[PDB]
Design a protein around this ligand. Structure first.
Ligand SMILES: C[C@@H]1OCC2(CCN(c3cnc4nc(Sc5ccnc(N)c5Cl)ccc4n3)CC2)[C@@H]1N
Length: 491
């Protein structure tokens, strides 16, 4: 559970000099690419020299050049640190020693006046809530503000953090190389005041949960950048989500994955029962009377039957497809539905395409799904095929997506005992996560109006604990905020 090898603020020259003077052969770090915004670079030292490996993410997955595709940067680094000779003139590159970052930019607790910090800890703070800010009078020094406990039963204690020769301390004891190490140490060994108060560092002060009516003000603030700082602070927390994906790695299931290293978590994966290893599909239940979701990949030819097994077993009545079958010359999803008015058998599952209806942004396909030999198992599945997501980036306007989800939501609500909504793109983490997150947030607003708290990164982190890398890019992160803002404006 450490993402210290990611340096959000260094340059290529800085990374090279840092690896050459503070690292050894096998040392590595990751950083945002300065030449290609939105991409990343893995800088690795070997034989006294540094190599820079490009990592692209257009919105679907992290694509390591000359390597594999991954759901998060943490899952990428974990894979190559644990598989000795995979990273590559075909020359083996070893990730051995993470070169740790000292920049606190991406920490949830790092931020700020002493009055304002007291205000924030006053209003949305709890016992043990804390933050670290730059000192008011002493430049280069810092302050740790902790809430312990409006009647005097709670207080805010400020603790001065002195920076002396690039090491930090709270006036005595140990001297730390970084604010992170200092906070980590006093998290485990909390300071005790003379009269007995224990300055427990329980959780960072939440600053991202806001009232729905404040979203426009917050978006204006993040656009002044605040968006990039908030997103990367979210990305750092991905190291808490390296849950097991063993079932997807079994030999019998390797070919059931569109991308061999983008796999469902074992504890939330959809388990296929009553099979002819026949229980696997690259798909996860997503739980936020709210609806739930199945986030899954675009079908392969050899997983179409499993897809319909899943849809039938989970009683799903709505499918959301957020990709064309072919985009930019590449196949993203095999056609798993019949032509209009046609009927097909996919293993033991029978599907009739009853009728298609074309809107501008999407096609709706009314499908009748049943198990062969059992006419009483028939149920209608409504497939919503979104077709206007741009080849590059995210939509410039969220209106098409919002109108699409509103229709999808009302179809689902009209169906008694409908199961989870199936959502899929290519790998099923980027666009799929974006649609699901928007739908989760919009449903809160739809039922409570402006009188509700929403917390975009918390919602994403919760969804990311159920499928790897849900919401892939900062552009998608911005698009979720813009979609929520637009939805609130048109209430
Ligand atoms: C230097 C920059 O200045 C401000 C700064 C970015 C904005 N701020 C924050 C605080 N917290 C955050 N938590 C998350 S993730 C999350 C959210 C809510 N709840 C839970 N449980 C989780 Cl895990 C994601 C983004 C977050 N941005 C404050 C810190 C930067 N450091």
């Amino acid at each position: 559970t450490s993402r210290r090898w990611f340096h959000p603020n260094i340059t290529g020259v800085e990374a090279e000099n840092l690896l050459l003077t503070r690292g050894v052969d096998g040392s590595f770090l990751a950083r945002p690419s300065k030449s290609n915004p939105g991409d990343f670079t893995l800088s690795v030292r070997r034989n006294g020299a540094v190599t820079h490996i490009k990592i692209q993410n257009t919105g679907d997955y992290y694509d390591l050049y000359g390597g594999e595709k991954f759901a998060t940067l943490a899952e990428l680094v974990q894979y190559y640190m644990e598989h000795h000779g995979q990273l590559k003139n075909g020359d083996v590159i070893e990730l051995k020693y993470p070169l740790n970052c000292a920049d606190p930019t991406s920490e949830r607790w790092f931020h700020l006046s002493g009055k304002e910090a007291e205000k924030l800890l006053t209003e949305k703070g709890k016992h043990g809530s804390f933050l670290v800010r730059e000192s008011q009078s002493h430049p280069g020094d810092f302050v740790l503000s902790v809430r312990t406990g409006n009647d005097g039963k709670s207080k805010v204690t400020h603790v001065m953090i002195r920076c002396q020769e690039l090491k930090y301390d709270v006036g005595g004891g140990e001297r730390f190389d970084s604010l992170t190490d200092l906070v980590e140490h006093y998290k485990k060994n909390p300071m005790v005041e003379t009269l007995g108060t224990v300055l427990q560092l329980k959780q960072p002060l939440n600053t991202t949960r806001i009232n729905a009516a404040e979203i426009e003000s917050r978006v204006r603030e993040l656009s002044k950048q605040g968006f990039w700082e908030e997103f990367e602070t979210l990305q750092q927390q991905e190291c808490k989500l390296l849950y097991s994906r063993k079932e997807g790695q079994r030999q019998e299931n390797k070919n059931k994955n569109r991308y061999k290293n983008i796999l469902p978590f074992d504890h939330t994966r959809v388990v296929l029962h009553d099979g002819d290893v026949s229980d696997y599909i690259n798909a996860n239940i997503i739980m936020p009377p709210k609806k739930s979701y199945i986030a899954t990949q675009g079908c392969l030819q050899n997983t179409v039957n499993d897809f319909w097994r899943m849809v039938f077993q989970e009683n799903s009545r709505v499918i959301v497809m957020t990709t064309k079958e072919v985009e930019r010359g590449k196949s993203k999803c095999v056609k798993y539905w019949p032509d209009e008015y046609a009927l097909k058998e996919y293993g033991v599952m029978r599907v009739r395409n009853v009728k298609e209806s074309a809107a501008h942004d999407y096609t709706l396909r009314e499908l009748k799904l049943s198990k062969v030999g059992q006419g009483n198992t028939e149920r209608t599945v409504w497939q919503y095929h979104f077709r206007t997501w741009p080849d590059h980036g995210v939509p410039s306007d969220p209106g098409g997506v919002l109108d699409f989800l509103e229709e999808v939501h009302h179809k689902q609500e009209s169906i008694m005992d409908a199961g989870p909504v199936v959502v899929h793109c290519s790998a099923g983490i980027g666009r799929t996560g974006t649609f699901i997150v928007i739908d989760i947030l919009i449903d809160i607003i739809r039922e409570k109006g402006v009188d509700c708290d929403i917390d975009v990164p918390k919602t994403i982190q919760m969804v990311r604990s159920q499928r790897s890398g849900m919401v892939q890019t900062e552009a998608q992160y911005r698009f979720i905020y813009m979609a929520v803002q637009h939805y609130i404006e048109t209430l």
